[PDB]
Amino acid sequence: YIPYVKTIPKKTAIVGTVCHECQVMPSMNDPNYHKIVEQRRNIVKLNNKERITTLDETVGVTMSHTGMSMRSDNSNFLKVGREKAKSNIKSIRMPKKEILDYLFKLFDEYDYWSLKGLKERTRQPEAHLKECLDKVATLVKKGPYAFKYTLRPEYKKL
Amino acid sequence: TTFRFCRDCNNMLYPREDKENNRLLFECRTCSYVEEAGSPLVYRHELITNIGETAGVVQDIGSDPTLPRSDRECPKCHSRENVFFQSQQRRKDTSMVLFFVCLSCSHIFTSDQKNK
């Protein structure tokens, strides 16, 4: 047998059995008769779709919003560059006299720290920030935790 | 030839032989349902077939405006109106015999005088 079938239980009940099949047809001897016939005839007569509208305005005006136009787009649609490019700020290098303590406290928190987070947390230029990181930590590229800086074993093993 | 169908699952019943009675029984191949055969015929190959000669005759065949009319007398009701059409078998081996359908009794007869 199979141990799993993945059923979906529900509350069901039989509320009757069909015994007679009927077809409702209006009697032809009714005063309101022949009104449904007109209604039925109107079904085919109907034309839901509408024809394409023709612009009667001057052709020069209609084409003013095409090609190289003096008008500038005011839409805010798919402005991904604008959304993120707005955020930009510089930061000065916090001297080794100060940030040296920051890194070791940072490493003590977690033992595998990425480059992108390090620049964000330190908020310093990557140029000098590299020198301290290489002097204290090392990066493993070929390991499973590839491209992540970790504190050197000399100081970690303490 | 008649193809009997199963009572319990609607599947066709093929012929089987019972040596205990040496009779013909139709049995099902899936649900094991048996029934005694009424005829000893099992295969009917018809190289020269007369079926389909009058195929397509309906209760309102005369309403067809393309079918030709004729004045031949129907030999069951003494009527003169009728429509005639050639054999509906399209194989190029059939004769040009006609088949007349009466518009008063829906009877089908033929004008052939060789075999009738």
Partner: protein, 163 residues
Amino acid sequence: FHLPVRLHRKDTRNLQFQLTRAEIVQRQKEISEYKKLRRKTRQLKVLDENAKKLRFEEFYPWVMEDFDGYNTWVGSYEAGNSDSYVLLSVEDDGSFTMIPADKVYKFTARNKYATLTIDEAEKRMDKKSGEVPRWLMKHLDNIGTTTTRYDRTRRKLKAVADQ
């Protein structure tokens, strides 16, 4: 039908080796006795909500099975007259009650004649022999292979009643 009867939505793939409700109940009794990164840019095709709801709702067809598994019917959704019917219910007083109809389902019995398996069917389709034996099912029935859930459950139930 052999009461009680269950009518639920369930997967019908391999609807020949699934445990019967009676078997499950028996299994419970013995068990108690025994214990005693993505692409970041994806395009989706637009689909009307109604069909998607129908597709998701109708993914698992209705299955009607009795307690002993003797009757096993699987339903299929029919759209020919799903919304063109209006059911009428007559109460036990001579009056008539109006109830609109929602859907129509077509149910067919299953496993009445011990169908074969996919591997067995494929092998027979191949050129294993000139033609399948006229009584192949009968021969395999005696061997005991290719049985039905009703027969499969009955033997197991009898195997327990004997002890």
